Curated annotation (Swiss-Prot), chain B:
The gene is ACAP1. GTPase-activating protein (GAP) for ADP ribosylation factor 6 (ARF6) required for clathrin-dependent export of proteins from recycling endosomes to trans-Golgi network and cell surface. Required for regulated export of ITGB1 from recycling endosomes to the cell surface and ITGB1-dependent cell migration. PH domain binds phospholipids including phosphatidic acid, phosphatidylinositol 3-phosphate, phosphatidylinositol 3,5-bisphosphate (PIP2) and phosphatidylinositol 3,4,5-trisphosphate (PIP3). May mediate ACAP1-binding to PIP2 or PIP3 containing membranes. Only one PH domain of one ACAP1 dimer inserts into the membrane, while the other PH domain acts primaryly to interact with adjacent ACAP1 dimers. Banana-shaped homodimer laterally assembling into tetramers, the tetramers further pack helically onto the membrane. Interacts with GTP-bound ARF6. Interacts with third cytoplasmic loop of SLC2A4/GLUT4. Interacts with CLTC. Interacts with GULP1. Forms a complex with GDP-bound ARF6 and GULP1. Interacts with ITGB1; required for ITGB1 recycling. Cells overexpressing ACAP1 show an accumulation of ITGB1 in recycling endosomes and inhibition of stimulation-dependent cell migration. Cells with reduced levels of ACAP1 or AKT1 and AKT2 show inhibition of stimulation-dependent cell migration. Cells overexpressing ACAP1 and PIP5K1C show formation of tubular structures derived from endosomal membranes. It is found in: Recycling endosome membrane. This is Arf-GAP with coiled-coil, ANK repeat and PH domain-containing protein 1. Highest level in lung and spleen. Low level in heart, kidney, liver and pancreas.
Length: 54, 55, 109, 147, 54, 54
């Protein structure tokens, strides 16, 4: 399928524990931390918009 | 200051969108919602330009 | 508050707790392999006992791996919707604000 | 109008999802209870571009002064044995050729599930996770020695 | 003799247990999926030693 | 090593991780009650949203 974490996580090697699989678990995580900082940047800007609005 | 505060908030919703998958609802709808937000900021800029003229 | 804060607050908890135990199980698997490899072949009973724990480590690590798989598979579908919902609620309040101001426009005119 | 139309597709889509990931969870407890495997991952001895291929984990001894044991991922391909040093980075050769190797089944060794591959320029002791895996890595090198 | 006799009851007893607590886990995912309640705990207006209690 | 050390090392991990999330859920329940109680009755939609989280 077409999902951003889908296409860079290996379901196929997930019972099988290859270096590929250890690489995907690590690789996919980088997007997770990315997504969490972007969510936080959106909350900070949200109070800035609330502050200037008011 | 308000239009710049908004303009920076609309870039933060955009940033999610290129992170995600590029599917039809994300690709077209999520983009049409946020570009309408920037279009509205510029029109509102024309009203602060015209208020200034007025003043 | 309803959306983005709920999202960063609730939404990575169950995946990071599955990540914690999965890498603990990795740890458990590596010493499991370690204790399986360093036994001498003459000490058969002890080695069989150590390989039985490795059948434990390997299985339950597969079990831990599936949970990580479930939980990453939820966040790929979930991330898109919640932030779409957030943008829905943004342009909703705008539509609601211009319409109140458009509604008396005739009286003003 | 766009908001209310999309927003309506959004509530059903995520109900759809709510069913979807629960179905997945329900197969998973069924997988764990009924089909979950304690056995080691087994390598496969199957033809490729140039003959039989096999790739998989093995234990080996380091080049430090204590000679301490360590786990690396090894490939048999084109009458060669290489070892991988990181994921997505060039490999290093362990034995130059396999047609010039012999394969030691080591019955008097102390170490368990071990074999030794001895070739003209280079030798390597190695150790696997099961008696199945010994015999399968020893047979793969032994077919390779006949190439 | 005591050790080997008890020790033999011990391996089966814990196999028995291994089945037991899995059965319990299997009812529990069935409870969570099918029978789990989101509603508030409801008090009960029922006669006791001296009349109605809640 | 086989018994007592394995026992203190492995055997309370999955119960203490269940304890952690259970008291986090308690926490979640208390603010859930908190947000369910402090809404005014005139703000019906908002209150229904808060009760859905409860």
């Amino acid at each position: 399928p077409l999902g951003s974490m889908t296409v860079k996580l290996d379901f196929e090697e997930c019972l099988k524990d290859s270096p590929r699989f250890r690489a995907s678990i690590e690789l996919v995580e980088a997007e997770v931390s990315e997504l969490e900082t972007r969510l936080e940047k959106l909350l900070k800007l949200g109070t800035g918009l609330l502050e200037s609005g008011r | 200051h308000y239009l710049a505060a908004s303009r920076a908030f609309v870039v933060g919703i955009c940033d999610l969108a290129r992170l995600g998958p590029p599917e039809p609802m994300m690709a077209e709808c999520l983009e049409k919602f946020t570009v309408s937000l920037n279009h509205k900021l510029d029109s509102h800029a024309e009203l602060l330009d015209a208020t200034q003229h007025t003043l | 508050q309803q959306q983005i804060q709920t999202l960063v607050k609730e939404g990575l908890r169950g995946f990071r707790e599955a990540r914690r135990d999965f890498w603990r199980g990795a740890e458990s698997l590596e010493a499991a392999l370690t204790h399986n490899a360093e036994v001498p072949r003459r000490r058969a009973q002890e080695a069989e006992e150590a390989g039985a724990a490795l059948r434990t480590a390997r299985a339950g690590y597969r079990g831990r791996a599936l949970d990580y798989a479930l939980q990453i598979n939820v966040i790929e579908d979930k991330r898109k919707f919640d932030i779409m919902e957030f943008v829905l609620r943004l342009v909703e309040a705008q539509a609601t604000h211009f319409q109140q101001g458009h509604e008396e426009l005739s009286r003003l005119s | 109008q766009y908001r209310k139309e999309l927003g309506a597709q959004l509530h059903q889509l995520v109900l759809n999802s709510a069913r979807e990931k629960r179905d997945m969870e329900q197969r998973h407890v069924l997988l764990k209870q009924k089909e979950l495997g304690g056995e080691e991952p087994e390598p496969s001895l199957r033809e490729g571009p140039g003959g039989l291929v096999m790739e998989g984990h093995l234990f080996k001894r380091a080049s430090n002064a204590f000679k301490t044991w360590s786990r690396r991922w090894f490939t048999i391909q084109s009458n060669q044995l290489v070892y991988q040093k990181k994921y997505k980075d060039p490999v290093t050769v362990v034995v130059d050729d396999l047609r010039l190797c012999t394969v030691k089944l080591c019955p008097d060794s102390e170490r368990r599930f071990c074999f030794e591959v001895v070739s003209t320029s280079k030798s390597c002791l190695l150790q696997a996770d099961s008696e199945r895996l010994l015999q399968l890595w020893v047979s793969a090198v032994q077919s390779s020695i006949a190439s």
